[model samples]
Target: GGAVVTVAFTNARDCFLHLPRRLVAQLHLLQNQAIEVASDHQPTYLSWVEGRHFNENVAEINRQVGQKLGLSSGDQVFLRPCSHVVSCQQVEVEPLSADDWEILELHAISLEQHLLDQIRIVFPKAVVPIWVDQQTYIFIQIVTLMPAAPYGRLETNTKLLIQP
Candidate 1:
């Protein structure tokens, strides 16, 4: 049977296909197993399936992948074991000048563990900005330190911002 499902949501930043237990079981899916993803009008792309928080009626894929494949929330996508193995290609690296660092000094935040590690492997002394290009759907941006918050003081802002 075809492993076709409707999307519930999409995340541009993350690269994954989230499925529910029911769907994963029915499709004989396993963690870290490579799979091919496609839609009626979209080009097939390589991806994998994993168990995630999902209801039987819906599934989720990366927003960037979804966009490239012309998928949207509620769009039907097809899944199958990948026929061939594909490795990642070269990632474009643009070193941020110290000038860039100077701009973000007041607002820079540490990069996430994975992103920093990836960047560090290539550019050892890199730490300047944090941004992602959802359009390219391949390269991840170096997320920089937090920008200097516009509001200088936390006293008045602290009490006003409370999470439930």
Candidate 2:
């Protein structure tokens, strides 16, 4: 079974959900464990618990994630454990726009380490934001996953391919 919780926005740019401690225990979710988040208008996607929330009925998510899910603050979303997330063999991604590329170029930053450090889940066509400095972010779009499943878990062994 899953829980229906109200959505709230977090300042974090990573695509992870923050559940209250009560809900986390009730859901049997471990720290940094993957979960499925779904809204009425969007299909289920993979995310993980990045932190704990204080409100029992609210789930904190990044604003970009909320936008991708077509959700708003105060909206209800479903949360459940994802049992089938596989360790990805290969993952391909690209910058969301020219500006995103420019930022990466200007900063001389590669996304590989940033992604491995911050993101835990990957799914095809999901737009993820990687925050570089405070309040600065560049969006990346998932182009492909080797298994072609609904989602996959990012592990140290996974090969990350970034497109120009």
The most accurate candidate by lDDT is 2
Give lDDT tens digits, candidate 2, residues 57-93.
Answer: 6888888777776778888888878755777899998
TM-score of 2: 0.88
lDDT of 2 at 103: 83
The deviation in Å at residue 128 for candidate 1 is 20
lDDT of 1 by residue, 1-164 (tens): 44877875554345456677787787775444455555556344333455455557356765554554456778777776543332222223232454444433443343233233212211112222233222222232222212222111111111111011
Estimated TM-score for each candidate:
0.48, 0.88
lDDT values for all models: 0.42, 0.76
After TM-score superposition, what is the CA distance of residue 155 in candidate 1 from its true location, in Å? 46
